[PDB]
């Protein structure tokens, strides 16, 4: 294990069914920054 | 809830659910205050009487109102208390909303509510 | 080239659309409810803190009044409510799709109905009852949360039916009375004569309109049908109005979500702090939370003010366009559509207005040989209005916009000086 | 320092060359067709004839333009040269 | 005077200049970089604090898109790229 | 320190928004002038 940031998804019943690891790659970083599992077509700024 | 869960929170971190320690039944917790309120006045100079509009109350035919009085009725903007309804239309004096306006008219005088008038009626035969 | 000119030989009628925002949502904030909820101790602490709720509410109420001002200034220009005519033909120009249909229950027109279906809004009704929010709960409705945290959305003064009535009156007035230089006393006139007058306005003879009335009417109807079909197909034609709606919704939901910030306190839950700590120790944490939440509200209000300024500019432009393109004929280039402006029709849309600009576009241009002046009997002749053209056999006078050769006559030319000055003069005769 | 503290400046989508190309196209179109009442489709016309048309637009007879063409052209060229010379000299013309 | 009128007898051609701003610089801000630098403890503390800077970046990106919109709406009006003529005289009017 | 620096960033962004509104007004005027003075002849007094 390593210290990292995650974004977890709770469904209607309260169970965790999916997650995003914010450090996997730039797409995951963008997903965590906007707090969404879906991204629309376009170009976005990320961290330096 | 899971056996290891006692409290529940919403997106704003407000405690919205709880398990009862004795019966173990889950309960939702809701705030007590709710609803928009507006006050219509002709000006303290003219009179101290006012009308009150409750946006989220349906008074048609337990009501969350401070004090029911005379002339309580429903408009497209909510429940109105303290104003008389007239079927005539005038130019808007005090804009209540959703096409309803209010004014201070002689019945002594009282607050009246009505539908606003859009303009003069005409017919230009082609 | 210095001796040739291209002249149009045909024309077509084009109708184009222009979408403009007019107003945004009116909002109100109960600062005590948002900051402290139902806690009496937090309320007393906030009273001691010296909150500035009144200032924020003054700003928000100003914005709310300005929205109704915008709508009134755009749509209520005409002071007479003209009735919808029973007949919707007016010499072959079909007006049925842009006027309310008596048979159908709806009070709007077909195109207005299409427009209102293209924008999706969640808040419809401006009434959410306590029993409803309590009964649902499981749904986690966004509006219920907004209202539970003291954020209210107020209804506009004018309903959709009233705005539709205004647009119907404007269209009927244009169809039956026309209007030339504003909205005064309606002066009835047959529609074909009005179209001839507007053709004269752009510099075309009335005979062109009268002789081709059927073709022009067919082109008008076809353009209307094309607009309708384009609107029917799914697209992003009304992206601006949807953007306005989305921005307002996002602002409110972000305000609700920001209640989970610690702001440097031990916890963001007021009940937790008031259950763990005594008054003196709880005061520090509650003061930190109060500062953070007041800052959040201030940011929301400032952004609302800036957006309101932008919307006001847009509404002013829309009112100017309604005054200068619908109630008159405009000579400004590209102000009302592309081409030569003939007329315009307004239609109501969610939080906005759609203008249909009918314009005249030349086409099928052909080249000709031209000269500056004509040297006749040792005298220079210049056209008073037009241009000298050579179609291959003889010289004529023609108008720039439309090709219609005329015999060079002394009634459409003038003389000045000799033939020794003008550069490129040509020799030819002038008839009576 | 700005970059080390996480402050970035992004480049515009259109380069200076593209904007210059747009302006060159506009000037060429005015000199060659000189649109009237919008862009539409370019209709060629000799420049002197266009100047006469504009003179008519401001309510002057075309013979005034045609008879004094050399003087009017000289005045136009002189005005352009004056603008160029004024720009060359150091000043605060572009203060905004 | 109620019986006299002044009439011009000559004319001149003038050319004047008008300068107008169109766009400004597009900027972006790195939240953590500005507030905390390269410190991990400060980063964790900021995450616990609940920063509100996705909002700031939304506003800045809106401005950045608006700048390109401004430039396009000003300069891209003509839909045809007319070529530069070889000759730049046009009857005595020097366009060089 | 975090509170202070966040306040600094917020002030910067607000001033940027106001300046952008001003620039947008100027650009709209410039577009209107391009349309009405370069692509046509204007009868409005002292507009071009
Ligand atoms: C406020 O609530 C009323 C409901 O009125 C009653 O009292 C409340 C407190 C609750 O107990 C309700 O369940 C009660 O109904 C709403 O008015 C009703 O709206 C509904 C939905 O639009 C109407 O249902 C339709 O109404 C038509 C019936 O037509 C015939 O009957 C009516 C009533 O007698 C009569 O006016 C009409 O002439 C006909 O005789 C019809 O479209 C369809 O069949 C259906 O029944 C219902 O009729 C309304 N009731 C009344 C008494 O007006 C209000 O809409 C609500 N206000 C707001 C702002 O939401
Ligand atoms: C003015 O236009 C209306 C509306 O016509 C419709 O919209 C136009 C913009 C065009 O796209 C038309 O093609 C389109 O229909 C005319 O009234 C409408 O006419 C149409 C036929 O042209 C009718 O449709 C018919 O309806 C039934 C059921 O299908 C059958 O007879 C036919 O199969 C056909 O579908 C339509 O009902 C009718 N009314 C409406 C409200 O659309 C109108 O005639 C015309 N006016 C004049 C003077 O020509
Ligand atoms: C259109 O104008 C160009 C440019 O002329 C220059 O700009 C004008 C606005 C005026 O201010 C002119 O005085 C100015 O020169 C004409 O082409 C240019 O002509 C000038 C002379 O008028 C040339 O300058 C000469 O160059 C050499 C080196 O010095 C020597 O012959 C002379 O000493 C003199 O300096 C210049 O090179 C030339 N080209 C350019 C790019 O400037 C052009 O002739 C004119 N068109 C017409 C049809 O008249
Ligand atoms: C949420 O859970 C329900 C119920 O799931 C079952 O009952 C719970 C009390 C718990 O014991 C679960 O582990 C059980 O699986 C789901 O709806 C039921 O799903 C099951 C399995 O497919 C099906 O047989 C039942 O008919 C469903 N009952 C209904 C629909 O009333 C539901 O799908 C879960 N939600 C999600 C998003 O997965
Ligand atoms: C916790 O105790 C309650 C109630 O305690 C008993 O009843 C009280 C009225 C009082 O007399 C106490 O001293 C008693 O010890 C339990 O609730 C009861 O649960 C039973 C289950 O069969 C039910 O039949 C009774 O009606 C319930 N009583 C009431 C008043 O509702 C509860 O189950 C205990 N919880 C646990 C986790 O053991
Ligand atoms: C140029 O226009 C003239 C005038 O209309 C054309 O001459 C006419 O030709 C038609 C047949 O095409 C005759 O019926 C008319 O009597 C002619 N009018 C005259 C002689 O005044 C001429 O054909 C045109 N030239 C071209 C090349 O199209
Ligand atoms: C108050 O109303 C009274 C009665 O019309 C009038 O005399 C007075 O001028 C008004 N204004 C005041 C008291 O400021
Ligand atoms: C057109 O330009 C040519 C160039 O050689 C010239 O000879 C001719 O006289 C010009 N024509 C006119 C009408 O000015």
Residue numbers in the entry:
A (entry chain B): 244 to 291
B (entry chain A): 532 to 592, 605 to 650, 658 to 676
C (entry chain B): 677 to 1108
D (entry chain C): 821 to 916
E (entry chain C): 677 to 772
F (entry chain C): 965 to 1012
Question: What does the literature reporting this entry say, word for word?
Answer:
SARSr-CoV spike proteins cover the coronavirus membrane and are exposed to the solvent environment in preparation for contacting a potential host cell, undergoing a suite of conformational changes to bind the viral receptor known as angiotensin converting enzyme 2 (ACE2, in the case of SARS-related coronaviruses) and mediate membrane fusion. Each spike is composed of three identical monomers containing key domains involved in restructuring from the pre- to post-fusion state as well as in receptor binding. These include the S1 receptor binding domain (RBD) and N-terminal domain (NTD), the S2 fusion protein (FP), heptad repeats, and the transmembrane domain (TM), among others. Here we report three novel structures of SARSr-CoV spike proteins belonging to bat SARSr-CoV WIV1 (hereafter WIV1), and civet SARSr-CoV SZ3 (hereafter SZ3) and SARSr-CoV 007 (hereafter 007), at resolutions of 1.88 Å, 1.92 Å, and 2.10 Å, respectively.
Coronavirus SZ3, which originated in bats and transmitted into civets sometime in the 1990s, is thought to be the result of a recombination event of bat CoV strains Rp3 and Rf1, with the recombination breakpoint at the nsp16/spike. Alignment analysis revealed other CoVs of bat origin were more divergent from SARS-CoV-2, but SZ3 is genetically close to SARS-CoV (GD03T0013) and the first epidemic SARS coronavirus GZ02. Previous studies have also demonstrated that the presence of a fatty acid in the FABP is responsible for regulation of the “up” or “down” conformation paradigm of the RBD, whereby presence of the acid ensures the RBD remains in the ‘down’ conformation and loss of the acid appears to permit adoption of the ‘up’ conformation. These structures reveal the presence of linoleic acid in the FABP of all three SARSr-CoV glycoproteins. Remarkably, the maps reveal a conserved network of water molecule coordination of the fatty acid inside the FABP. These waters support the acid within the pocket, in addition to a single putative hydrogen bond formed between the carboxylate head of the linoleic acid and residue R382 of the spike protein, at distances of 2.4 Å (SZ3), 2.7 Å (007) and 3.2 Å (WIV1). (c) Water molecule coordination between the linoleic acid and chain A of the cCoV-SZ3 spike is represented by a yellow dotted line. (c) The SZ3 map possesses the most isotropic biliverdin density. For example, in the SZ3 spike structure, the oxygen atoms of the fucose molecule on the N770 glycosylation form putative hydrogen bonds with the side chains of S901 and Q904, stabilizing the carbohydrate tree. Further, the glycosylation on N145 coordinates two water molecules between the fucose and a main chain carbonyl group of the glycoprotein. Further, N709, N1134, N1074 and N1098 are glycosites on the distal end of S2 near the transmembrane domain of the SARS-CoV-2 spike and are conserved in WIV1 (except for N1074) and SZ3 (except for N1134).
